[PDB]
Design a protein around this ligand. Structure first.
Ligand SMILES: [Ca+2]
Lengths: 551, 195
């Protein structure tokens, strides 16, 4: 999920522009639903994922707001020392403790009802039982018991009119998430609200904690610990699932390095001084088709061709890979150019030479993957630097800056030696695959797909009902743009394939089923009515409902 | 006690709800979602409350069941029930109005069979009335669990356990700090400007 905010001081016409692209994966019908709520204190306009009473992405004519994936740790797993005699007892403080159990009844169509038992410890519910090791893993969450509080805090942020009313609502948030601020005055802000626990020095963040009473939470950390950035001297705030702020250690699930997908958006800001609204919108144009892991390997490939002897062994594809701008180019397709194909197979051979010897058999698939977009294979809703690539990058600096305390994964062989061997192995693999002719090498272009089944593995529609177009775009599922001109409020959103997910008994579909699909492909954007004046003028249909509740 | 909820749609079929009360605002909002995406939301609640196998039955290999046990394990229904009841009158009408608004159009489906979606005919089952507990669960199952419940500790422990078997506690823990580093490189990319 990517978001980049701009301050009027960095904009030509002097308007606050907030563009958000949250990526959850592309599904049919649309993942996000557009709504404009007016009255009872609320005066908001925009769209929200699934169907939540709250609005994640939109504006209230006073301030806009975006969102991304949570980059902070809130969930810890504790390993309880199980009794060697009894399975339901665990060692907690002094002495033994019995687990709590509750029975859930699963209803199945065509078959009898299935029954299961869920065990619970002092920390939380268990996820995995290991009987031969004598340890059970329980899941303790910091946001547990504060589900509705985080739901309502996200709701009341729509009624807010300033940064101080934006910040105190974030203090009520328990779940790990990122919030973004942009007002009509010209101010932009960022906060990462979460109920952060204060862990002891004995506890390692990457591995499970001791569930015996010796290693427990000291308490919930204060709000001052939560990272917050309001109006940076640079005049822009960029976040693409990257690190929250400097001073925060890596979580158990997310690991970051100097090579990050954030640099794909930020590098566009260090070109010109002032950008127009149309130009800032065209940041998504380049970031979608640009390669993520190209900016960091290119300097490490320049010192290759030279002073490397021009004896043509190989240097055949190495000199060409340099003429690559790091972009997907369709022609058939079929990628226009053998540069991406060679670079893909080069990285795959780099994992074989360095990582596979040290990485165990079970976790070998976590580092062998290159993390590239493909035509047929089920690719994720967001393309990233793979864990195999991240280790290669930070250890490549370790040769330039030696450290005795750390161990080098390259070991005996230098950087230039391994990168040469991988280049020879990549060329040898493609020579027997697509012929000896180098110029004719090409890989099938990645197809952008809208799957009928959602993220969790449940069909949202009938099987087969899918939309697909050639050319994978590293965008969000929904792209919103809030521009605060001198007028000055303009909301513009784009969500494929459309608003209505209705299909008639005969087979015909709603007119608002495919109306936004073609608009999304061309990086275009639709205007949405914000104020009470123009909504009654640009209305297509009106329906009045009647309610009679009992207070 | 009778309130009117005026729902108005634009050129791209996007609803705009006008009301005066908390119950009324989310009644029209609940009514609009039922018109556009009825089957999508019926399958949404089941994905997070754990009732997918009730209408889809067993998967090619108990895929809808094995999963149905996984989702029920993650949350506790008793803990959420207290949290909803603890809310005030105006706060509860947000979820109740959403449930009653969705059921308003749902009750109209029984009256006129032409309003029934195609997906209900193909999968061969009848739609169910939405409750206030379901509305909360749709947010808790997708938001907070799939973004604030991401855990990868047990797999990290198994890797460190395997590395200490082949290389010992000296080299195994040294190689573990290279593959899964405790702290990121001191020069990464951060949102706030450093220094
Ligand atoms: Ca943790």
């Amino acid at each position: 999920s990517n978001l980049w905010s701009t301050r009027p001081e960095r904009v030509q016409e002097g308007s606050t522009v907030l563009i958000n692209g949250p990526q959850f994966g592309w599904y049919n019908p649309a993942y996000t639903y557009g709504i404009g709520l007016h009255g009872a204190g609320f005066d908001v306009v925009g769209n929200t994922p699934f169907a939540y009473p709250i609005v994640l992405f939109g504006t209230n004519s006073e301030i806009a707001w975006g969102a991304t994936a949570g980059p902070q740790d809130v969930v810890d797993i504790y390993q309880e020392k199980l009794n060697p005699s009894r399975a339901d007892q665990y060692w907690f403080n002094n002495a033994w403790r019995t687990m709590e159990q509750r029975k859930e009844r699963i209803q199945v169509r065509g078959q009898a009802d299935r029954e299961m038992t869920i065990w619970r410890t002092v920390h939380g519910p268990v996820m995995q039982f290991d009987y031969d090791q004598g340890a059970a893993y329980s899941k303790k969450r910091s946001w547990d018991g504060y589900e509705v509080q985080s739901l309502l805090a996200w709701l009341n942020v729509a009624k807010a009119r300033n940064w101080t009313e934006f910040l105190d609502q974030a203090s009520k948030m328990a779940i790990s998430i990122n919030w973004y601020y942009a007002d009509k005055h010209g101010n932009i802000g960022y906060v990462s609200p979460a109920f952060l626990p204060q862990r002891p020095a004995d506890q390692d963040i990457r591995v499970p904690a001791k569930g015996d009473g010796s290693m427990e939470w000291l308490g919930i950390k204060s709000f001052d610990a939560i990272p917050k950035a309001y109006n940076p001297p640079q005049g822009y705030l960029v976040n693409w699932n990257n690190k929250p702020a400097p001073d925060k250690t890596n979580t158990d699930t997310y690991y970051w390095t100097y090579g990050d997908r954030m640099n794909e958006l930020v590098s566009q800001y260090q070109q010109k001084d002032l950008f127009s609204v149309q130009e800032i919108w065209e940041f998504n144009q380049k970031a979608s088709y640009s390669d993520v892991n190209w900016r960091y390997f290119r300097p490490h490939l320049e010192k290759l061709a030279q002073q490397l002897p021009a004896d043509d062994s190989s240097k055949a594809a190495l000199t060409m890979l340099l003429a690559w701008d790091g972009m997907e180019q369709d022609q058939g397709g079929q990628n226009a150019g053998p540069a991406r194909v060679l670079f893909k197979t080069w990285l795959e051979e780099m994992y074989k030479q360095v990582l596979m010897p040290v990485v165990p058999e079970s976790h070998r698939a976590m580092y062998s993957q290159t993390g590239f977009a493909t035509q047929q294979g089920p690719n994720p809703g967001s393309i990233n630097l793979s864990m195999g690539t991240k280790v290669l990058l930070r250890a490549l600096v370790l040769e330039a800056h030696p450290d005795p305390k750390r161990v080098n994964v390259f070991g005996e062989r230098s950087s230039q030696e391994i990168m040469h061997t991988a280049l020879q192995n990549a060329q040898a693999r493609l020579s027997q695959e697509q012929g000896a002719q180098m110029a004719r090498w090409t890989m099938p272009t990645s197809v952008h797909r809208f799957s009928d089944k959602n993220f969790t593995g449940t069909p949202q529609t009938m099987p087969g009902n899918t939309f697909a177009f050639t050319g994978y775009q590293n965008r969000g599922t929904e792209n919103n743009r809030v521009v605060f001109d001198a007028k000055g409020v303009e909301f513009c959103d784009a969500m494929p394939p459309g608003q209505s997910g209705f299909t008639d008994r005969n087979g015909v579909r709603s007119p608002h089923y495919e109306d936004q699909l073609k608009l999304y492909e061309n990086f275009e954007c639709k205007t949405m009515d914000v104020t009470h004046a123009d909504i009654r003028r640009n209305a297509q249909s009106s329906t009045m409902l009647l309610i009679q509740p009992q207070p | 006690q009778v309130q009117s909820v005026e729902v108005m749609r634009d050129s791209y079929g996007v609803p705009h709800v006008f009301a005066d009360s908390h119950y009324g605002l989310y009644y029209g909002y609940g009514y609009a979602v039922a018109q556009d995406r009825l089957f999508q939301m019926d399958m949404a609640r089941r994905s997070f409350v754990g009732t997918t196998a009730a209408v889809l039955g067993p998967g090619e290999q108990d895929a809808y069941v094995k999963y149905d046990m996984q989702v029920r394990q993650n949350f506790t229904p008793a803990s959420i029930q207290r949290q909803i009841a603890a809310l005030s009158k105006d706060e509860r009408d947000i979820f109740r109005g959403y449930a009653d608004g969705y059921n308003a159009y749902l009750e109209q489906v029984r009256r006129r069979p032409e309003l029934l979606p195609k997906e209900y005919v193909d999968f061969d089952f009848q739609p169910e009335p939405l409750t206030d507990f379901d509305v909360v669960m749709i947010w808790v199952g997708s938001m907070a669990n799939r973004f604030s419940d991401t855990n990868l500790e047990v797999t990290a422990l198994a890797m460190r356990q395997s590395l200490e078997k082949q290389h010992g506690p000296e080299r195994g823990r040294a190689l573990f700090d290279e593959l899964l580093w405790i702290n990121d490189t001191t020069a990464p990319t951060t949102v706030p400007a450093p220094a």
